[PDB]
Design an enzyme around this catalytic site. Structure first.
Site, mmCIF file in Angstrom:
data_model
loop_
_atom_site.group_PDB
_atom_site.id
_atom_site.type_symbol
_atom_site.label_atom_id
_atom_site.label_comp_id
_atom_site.label_asym_id
_atom_site.label_seq_id
_atom_site.Cartn_x
_atom_site.Cartn_y
_atom_site.Cartn_z
ATOM 1 N N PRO B 1 -13.374 21.237 72.148
ATOM 2 C CA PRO B 1 -13.494 20.883 73.562
ATOM 3 C C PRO B 1 -14.838 20.273 73.866
ATOM 4 O O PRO B 1 -15.838 20.512 73.198
ATOM 5 C CB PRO B 1 -13.357 22.220 74.297
ATOM 6 C CG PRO B 1 -12.711 23.128 73.340
ATOM 7 C CD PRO B 1 -13.143 22.678 71.974
ATOM 8 N N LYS B 32 -11.210 28.615 71.526
ATOM 9 C CA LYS B 32 -11.515 27.743 70.415
ATOM 10 C C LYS B 32 -12.846 28.132 69.789
ATOM 11 O O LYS B 32 -13.737 28.667 70.466
ATOM 12 C CB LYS B 32 -11.572 26.290 70.876
ATOM 13 C CG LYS B 32 -10.284 25.824 71.525
ATOM 14 C CD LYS B 32 -9.547 24.804 70.701
ATOM 15 C CE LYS B 32 -8.398 24.196 71.503
ATOM 16 N NZ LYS B 32 -7.734 23.039 70.827
ATOM 17 N N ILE B 64 -8.014 19.442 73.281
ATOM 18 C CA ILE B 64 -6.704 19.246 72.669
ATOM 19 C C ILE B 64 -5.914 20.517 72.965
ATOM 20 O O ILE B 64 -6.136 21.550 72.336
ATOM 21 C CB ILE B 64 -6.809 18.985 71.165
ATOM 22 C CG1 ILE B 64 -7.640 17.736 70.943
ATOM 23 C CG2 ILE B 64 -5.429 18.782 70.547
ATOM 24 C CD1 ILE B 64 -8.055 17.544 69.495
ATOM 25 N N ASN B 97 -12.741 17.445 86.408
ATOM 26 C CA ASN B 97 -11.553 16.764 85.925
ATOM 27 C C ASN B 97 -11.162 17.347 84.564
ATOM 28 O O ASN B 97 -12.004 17.449 83.675
ATOM 29 C CB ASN B 97 -11.800 15.274 85.772
ATOM 30 C CG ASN B 97 -11.866 14.544 87.101
ATOM 31 O OD1 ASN B 97 -11.364 15.012 88.103
ATOM 32 N ND2 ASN B 97 -12.490 13.381 87.088
#
Lengths: 114, 114, 114
Positions: B1, B32, B64, B97
């Site tokens: 990330p 993660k 992802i 976002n």
């Protein structure tokens, strides 16, 4: 196409020719004329990768087409190679986000490409 | 990330360990490994939110997977909380976002994650 | 909506009030209240367009709705016009990327719009 590099390497370590080198290499890789390629390099950033502040880079490549599975693997080799050679960044400390843009969603010269 | 914070708060107001804190908090929230988490903080920016230049932030989180309705609410509470506590930004002057990236569109170490 | 301008024009060439003008013009063009418009201007950047360092700009507009074929043409005429008149940037050296954001993927005020 437009290519952005954000990095914690200092401005003084970015070679003077780097934006022109990127422009030419991206034109060859994408098959687009250099006139259409825009490049943006942002050094001196406050960044960490894996918790460490060793040199790293977060990049983005936006293109109308020429984005996809095999193409993106090729771009990653090209760009990690350039960042390694010119900015001395280890390739496992580079992320590149790839964006396939719709022509209706890219503005240029008072209009869009659609 | 990959988490990016752009803010008009001055660099002197960013706490010394803030990048490490973000890394650890994001690891816990997303599940993660810290090794794959990149954080980027950009202070001293020329920004306005609602016409006013009071402290504000524009942020992006790219991952992802691990992006979706309920997860994004949880991330927003976590991240608005940190920005309020550490940088003294009001949560109603923050936008985040969220981007669910296809693995084929994230380059890393001469390849992609596909 | 969120509008970001990255440019190699110097900070001293950004007119007083430009962030207010952008807020007001984007409110009119998108139909959204000014309170929910954020603007971010990044001058003095290391950039090239077509292999030249003459003034240029790379921009992004992110909105929940109000993005589409005809709307984006209207935004591009507006925004290229403003950059040409206020910052003396030629419109054929501007790219604007448009993003239609899902409400579930925008965080604000400790939550999301979903």
């Amino acid at each position: 196409p437009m290519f952005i590099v954000n990095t914690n390497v200092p401005r003084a370590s970015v070679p003077d020719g780097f934006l022109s080198e990127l422009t030419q290499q991206l034109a060859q890789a994408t098959g687009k004329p250099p006139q259409y390629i825009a490049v943006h390099v942002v050094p001196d950033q406050l960044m960490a990768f894996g918790g460490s502040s060793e040199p790293c880079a977060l990049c983005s490549l936006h293109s109308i087409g020429k984005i996809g599975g095999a193409q993106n693997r090729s771009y990653s080799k090209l760009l990690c190679g350039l960042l390694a050679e010119r900015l001395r960044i280890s390739p496992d400390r580079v992320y590149i986000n790839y964006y396939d843009m719709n022509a209706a969603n890219v503005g240029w010269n008072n209009s869009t490409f659609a």
